[PDB]
Write a protein that binds this DNA or RNA. Structure first.
Lengths: 83, 211, 290
RNA sequence: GUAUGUCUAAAGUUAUGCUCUUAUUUACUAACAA
RNA sequence: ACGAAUCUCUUUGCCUUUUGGCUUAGAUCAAGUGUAGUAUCUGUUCUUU
């Protein structure tokens, strides 16, 4: 799977996470003030943190699963064994 | 006592050698030898080549294989290394088969402990020294803090001494921004956001002060 | 359990009298040494100091007649118990962070400095304005010293994470301690055999040391779980306080017991004439007794 | 014994299962002695 | 039963602390003691759990 597909497929996913539940320009300054809902941005912030948190804890679990000497080697032998 | 090396391969010793081989590989025979207090480099390497290496085989020969062997003997007279290679076996074993066809613990535990210690210690002295200095440095820092904190409790405010800057252009990063590469100029307006973040920052500082 | 407001300014240095000790000596951060008793009727006899800075390390002699005192303005002062008119040491290089007198003869008297040079002062030698001999085998500020209780051997840890068993006056390290640990407060457990020299660390873990012989130093079991910026004292039990919250009683045999609330600060001590009574030293006139 | 690298070298910036006792090994280290 | 959300696991995908040069393998593999330290040994006794 390429990063082309994995992007669109992850795009499709977070659209399902959405599916759960004005422009004003001063052309002299060039400042395009898009006044939008402050509640929705907060809902993005919390959701995005939660998504990253979910992933963060996902590694933590997978790190705590278990012919080596030190932390790295064990994993390096695991990088060899997967092949 | 110092002495001339040799003897016989105790199973523990063999295991140790195997471990070493896994660690250091098949061409650093000195180090592996060193790991074994009894056995030499040459001895070790020979052993690995002859007995210990897993990509050898000691399974019995099929009738066809027997034929191949004895035929080789008939044709290549006692050039047993060559013969071994032809067979695809180690040579001593082949020879033995051919012949057949024709008719204390404290010390050991010491080296073990030492061995395991070594194998689980895989850094040059520079590394070890560096980590030592790091932990020492940390300790020093905490001691300094304890003094400073103690004085604060006592009522004397002491600012923490800077790191004695190594060179003229050495940087303290809390003075001012590291190399403020600013964001790309604003297409969408950013003013309210700037304010809010500023407030958040100042608030955080306040919290820290109170903390 | 029960309180007493002593020193309104933060830091304190609470200590009982020796063995047969009915008294509660304090000397806080408010540059004033004060005196209160174990009898609930807390009676105030204020030993006023003269020197400008706050008073830091206060300890008694074996006699219970004169107590030493250290401040930040290079000033150590000896103090007679009830009267308080007594020999004085106005002049030093800079603050001695910790000081202790001999547990067998009140005459000999060690002061330990920030410059890492330790100083004797006998009774006739305090009259001389001299030293029996200095020590200079610690290089960092020492802030920490206490005698092996027979009077002879003498220990002083330091800011560089090193402890030093000495003979009383020899000025030659019997033993420098290991490096990778850290140490702050040195206190000998009232150990029945009297083998043990305990000491608090920076890294939340009080240690134990076989002080007889002085060359012995293998810790048996370490007392973990007291986020340390403070102090600790023994009698069965060792009780030490932490930086953040509250005090910690610990079974000296197994290293685990109750964790009593303090209210911050932490300097624990035991009323040794009794079996079960503690003093906590909170910051800013919050001394708790049990 | 060195390169080398840290350290010190004084003036106050105006806030409210264990403990123990020992004896033995081995290793490493040691400009300390032989 | 279909739709959705939450949780756990399994299969795959992602390698997520996952080897960062070159030379003659870069070169050569020892004969030590006592004194001290340090650690590590092992025994050794007793205590109480």
């Amino acid at each position: 799977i390429s990063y082309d597909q994995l992007a669109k497929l992850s795009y499709e996913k977070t659209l399902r996470n959405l599916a759960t539940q004005k422009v004003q320009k001063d052309t002299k300054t060039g400042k395009i003030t898009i006044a939008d809902d402050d509640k929705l941005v907060n809902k993005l912030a919390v959701s995005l943190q939660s998504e990253s948190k979910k992933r963060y804890e996902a590694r933590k679990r997978q790190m705590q699963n278990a012919s080596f000497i030190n932390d790295k080697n064990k994993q390096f032998n695991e990088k060899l064994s997967r092949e | 006592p110092i002495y001339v090396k040799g003897g016989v391969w105790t199973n523990v010793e063999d295991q140790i050698l195997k471990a070493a081989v896994q660690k250091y590989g098949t061409h650093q025979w000195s180090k592996v030898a060193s790991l074994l207090q009894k056995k030499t480099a040459r001895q070790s390497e020979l052993r690995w080549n002859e007995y210990l290496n897993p990509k050898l085989n000691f399974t019995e020969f099929s009738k066809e294989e027997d034929a191949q062997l004895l035929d080789l003997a008939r044709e290549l007279p006692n050039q047993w290394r060559t013969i071994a290679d032809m067979m695809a076996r180690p040579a001593q074993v082949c020879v033995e088969r051919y012949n057949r066809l024709l008719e204390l613990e404290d010390e050991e535990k010491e080296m073990l402990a030492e061995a395991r210690a070594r194998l689980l210690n895989t850094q040059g002295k520079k590394a070890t020294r560096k980590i030592r200095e790091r932990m020492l440095e940390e300790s020093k820092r905490i001691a300094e803090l304890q003094k400073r904190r103690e004085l604060k409790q006592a009522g004397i405010n002491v600012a923490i001494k800077k790191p004695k800057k190594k060179y003229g252009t050495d940087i303290d990063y809390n003075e001012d921004i590291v190399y403020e590469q600013a964001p790309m100029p604003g297409i969408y307006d950013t003013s309210t956001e700037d304010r809010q973040i500023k407030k958040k920052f100042e608030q955080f500082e306040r919290k820290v002060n109170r903390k | 359990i029960r309180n007493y407001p002593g020193h309104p300014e933060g830091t304190t240095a609470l200590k009982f009298l020796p063995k047969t000790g009915h008294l509660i000596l304090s000397g806080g951060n408010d540059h004033t040494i004060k005196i209160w008793d174990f009898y609930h009727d807390y009676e105030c006899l204020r030993d006023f100091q003269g020197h400008n800075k706050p008073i830091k390390a206060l300890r008694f002699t074996e006699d219970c007649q004169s107590f030493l005192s250290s401040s930040f303005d290079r000033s150590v002062k000896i103090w007679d118990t009830e009267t308080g008119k007594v020999k004085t040491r106005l002049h030093l290089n800079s603050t001695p962070a910790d000081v202790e007198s001999r547990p067998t003869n009140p005459h000999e008297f060690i002061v330990g400095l920030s410059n890492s040079k330790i100083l004797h002062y006998d009774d006739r030698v305090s009259e001389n304005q001299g030293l029996v001999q200095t020590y200079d085998h610690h290089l960092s500020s020492i802030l920490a010293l206490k005698y092996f209780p027979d009077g002879s051997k003498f220990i002083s840890s330091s800011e560089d994470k090193t402890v030093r068993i000495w003979e009383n006056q020899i000025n030659v390290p019997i033993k420098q301690i290991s490096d990778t640990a850290q140490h702050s407060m040195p206190f000998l457990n009232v150990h029945p055999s009297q083998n043990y020299f305990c000491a608090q660390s920076m890294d939340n873990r009080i240690y134990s040391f076989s002080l007889k012989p002085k060359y012995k130093r293998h810790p048996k079991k370490i007392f973990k779980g007291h986020s340390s910026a403070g102090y600790g004292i023994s009698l069965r039990y060792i009780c030490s306080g932490d930086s953040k919250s509250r005090l910690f009683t610990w079974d000296w045999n197994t290293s685990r017991l109750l964790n009593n609330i303090n209210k911050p600060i932490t300097q624990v001590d035991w009323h040794p004439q009794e079996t079960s009574k503690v003093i906590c030293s909170g910051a800013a006139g919050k001394i708790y007794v049990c």
